[PDB]
Design a protein around this ligand. Structure first.
Ligand SMILES: Cc1cc2nc3c(=O)[nH]c(=O)nc-3n(C[C@H](O)[C@H](O)[C@H](O)COP(=O)(O)OP(=O)(O)OC[C@H]3O[C@@H](n4cnc5c(N)ncnc54)[C@H](O)[C@@H]3O)c2cc1C
Ligand SMILES: [Ca+2]
Length: 267
């Protein structure tokens, strides 16, 4: 009954660095989660796939912390745990199964919601069980029950991923690290770092980054929003970008290429 609730700007809680006002509820316990979800809500993970508009959102924005950030690689892993932590912890433990998720700056819950992945593997591959809170109760699902597709899930309506069990296998630490090194090599062309990740989806048999590059769109700038000079499928925030500027740049790309956004827009 004593969870932290505060007014924030979502620009401070997204990797893109844009976003207006929201009421943030930081939940540490199952009872606090039950209370936070009594009115309309959204769940915020690491904010790495969100384009939040300058007006912000009116709903309660829930962050999972406390018990939801504790983990055991061989047991339950809280959904508020950072996926980059688990990738490194698995290597340390000689546990294979997360290597293909290197470089994805997600919380576990966000990685499940967006079935985050690379050419090497996806979040769904690494799951044994998923606890989802919906309709006022906690339920346990196998991943085959969650409607996974390419960078997609079909969670129960209003579902909050709270905890998972991972599917991992014993391998030599050095081998795990070699696999991770290939993932790192494959990601070398992405910006030395800053964004909400890939802005656009790839059309069937096409590449968004390559298409944007060939169209000469790298370097186009609206205010402080710019198509990265390093990778065509990244829009970067050069300092004080507004979401309006990012959307304008998106529209400019879409005037040239029939691309759909990979980012989710709030509200
Ligand atoms: C530098 C960079 C590189 C990236 N590379 C990749 C990549 O290689 N592959 C890839 O797939 N994606 C990539 N992304 C996109 C992004 O990291 C993924 O979509 C990631 O899964 C989002 O997780 P998040 O915790 O940041 O979620 P957020 O952006 O916070 O939220 C995304 C969605 O998940 C929901 N959500 C968050 N937590 C929960 C929860 N506990 N329960 C239910 N719903 C929840 C939110 O409501 C929202 O709908 C990249 C992003 C960046 C910035
Ligand atoms: Ca079940």
């Amino acid at each position: 009954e004593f969870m932290r609730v505060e007014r924030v700007l979502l620009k401070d809680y997204t990797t893109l660095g844009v976003g207006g006002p929201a009421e943030l509820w930081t939940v540490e316990t199952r009872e606090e989660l039950k209370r936070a979800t009594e009115a309309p809500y959204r769940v915020l993970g690491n904010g790495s796939n969100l384009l939040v508009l300058d007006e912000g959102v009116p709903e309660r924005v829930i962050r999972l912390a406390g018990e939801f950030q504790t983990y055991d690689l061989k047991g339950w892993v809280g959904a508020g745990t950072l996926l980059p932590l688990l990738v490194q912890e698995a290597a340390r433990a000689g546990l294979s199964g997360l290597e293909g998720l290197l470089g994805i700056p997600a919380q576990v819950g966000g990685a499940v919601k967006m079935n985050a992945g690379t050419r090497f593997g996806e979040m769904a591959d690494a799951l044994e069980a998923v606890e989802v809170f919906h309709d006022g109760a906690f339920h346990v699902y196998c991943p085959e029950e969650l409607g996974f597709g390419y960078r997609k899930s079909h969670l129960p309506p209003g579902g909050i991923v709270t905890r998972v069990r991972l599917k991992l296998k014993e391998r030599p630490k050095e081998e795990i690290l070699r696999r991770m090194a290939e993932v790192d090599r494959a990601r070398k062309g992405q910006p030395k770092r800053k964004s909400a990740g890939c802005a656009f989806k790839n059309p069937p048999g096409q590449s968004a980054g390559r298409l944007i590059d060939e169209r000469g769109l790298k370097g186009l700038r609206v205010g402080d929003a710019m198509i990265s000079l390093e990778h065509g499928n990244f829009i970067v925030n050069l300092g004080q970008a507004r979401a309006k500027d990012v959307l304008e740049l998106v529209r400019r790309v879409q005037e040239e290429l029939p691309l759909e956004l990979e980012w989710e827009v709030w509200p």
